[PDB]
């Protein structure tokens, strides 16, 4: 379980050059990377690079060339060439240390976030107000009632006889 | 909770879209988690069904134990069986206008139930 750490790169990575990453990862002071790497196995005899990625050694090797940010640090251990066994990700890519999984883990995290949001919305809308068997059974004025007549409705026809005799005067002054 | 649910849905959609874009860009011990999850799901289903049963069979059991004030299934059929029959213009059923033998002039009936917070209150359907 090498995913519980939530570290980031703020000052330990002052530059993203080729030789700076190796010097940063080889000298962890205090936190730069996992101290249980093959740094001691590479510096056991002398300054070389056989035990780093050439020979058979369980070391965090550069699985791919990435000069811009950082190479893909993977625990490379294989007797033959062109092979990488991925189990985690301790690099500074994406500013987080995930499990280096496929679209499965991303879709699972998205579904978890969506389910959390849906549960929150359901809890918020549940205890707001609910209907009952009886309409407003709790606690145990005239703005829609339009009284129609339609007998003397003729008055509306007479309505179009006042503005013709004298029309209103527009003001445009809401004092 | 309109704005709260809207913000929750927006956050969920943002997270889903971010995860989908990340996936697209990348493409080119006595734990017994299952048992605990099944137990929690059973507990949740039981709580939901109990809430439903409390909403249905406990708040509607008024007239089932003793006939009390309730227009639902206790008042409308009374006046129906006692005075007139069912008819649907909108909700107008059997207006009293002596149309059986009047032959003078027709009149309809605007009769409709209403609600009010009180004790022992019927529908009070509306010359006058």
């Amino acid at each position: 379980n090498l995913l519980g750490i939530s570290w980031v790169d703020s000052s330990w990575i002052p530059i993203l050059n080729s030789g700076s990453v190796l010097d940063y990862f080889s000298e962890r002071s205090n936190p730069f990377y996992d101290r249980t790497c093959n740094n001691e196995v590479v510096k056991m005899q002398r300054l070389t690079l056989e035990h780093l990625n050439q020979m058979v050694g369980i070391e965090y090797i550069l699985l791919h060339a990435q000069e811009p940010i950082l190479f893909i640090i993977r625990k490379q251990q294989r007797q033959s060439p062109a092979q990488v066994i991925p189990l985690a990700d301790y690099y500074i890519i994406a500013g987080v240390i995930y499990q280096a999984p496929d679209l499965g883990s991303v879709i699972n995290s998205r579904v978890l976030t969506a389910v959390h949001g849906i549960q929150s919305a359901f809890d918020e809308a549940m205890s707001y107000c609910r209907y009952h068997p009886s309409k407003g059974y709790w606690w145990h004025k005239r703005k829609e009632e339009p009284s129609s007549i339609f007998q003397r409705q003729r008055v509306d026809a007479l309505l179009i006889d006042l503005r013709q005799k004298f029309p209103p005067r527009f003001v445009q002054q809401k004092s | 909770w309109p704005w709260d649910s809207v913000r929750n849905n927006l956050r969920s959609a943002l997270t889903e879209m971010c995860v989908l874009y990340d996936v697209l860009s990348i493409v080119r011990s006595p734990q017994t988690l299952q048992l605990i999850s099944k137990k929690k799901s059973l507990a949740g289903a039981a709580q939901i069904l109990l809430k439903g049963a409390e909403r249905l069979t406990k708040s509607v059991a008024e007239n089932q134990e003793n006939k009390l004030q309730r227009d639902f299934n206790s008042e409308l059929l009374r006046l129906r069986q006692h005075w007139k029959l069912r008819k649907v213009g909108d909700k107008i059923l059997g207006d009293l206008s002596y149309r059986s033998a009047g032959s003078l002039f027709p009149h309809h009936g605007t009769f409709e139930v209403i609600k009010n917070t009180d004790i022992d209150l019927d529908k009070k359907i509306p010359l006058e």
Binding site: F150, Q172 | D90
Partner: peptide, 19 residues
């Protein structure tokens, strides 16, 4: 500036008395 039109429709007294 209340209105700049000629209005007679808003009253719209309904019938709702279909027999």
């Amino acid at each position: 500036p209340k209105k700049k039109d000629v209005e007679f429709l808003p009253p719209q007294l309904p019938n709702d008395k279909f027999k």
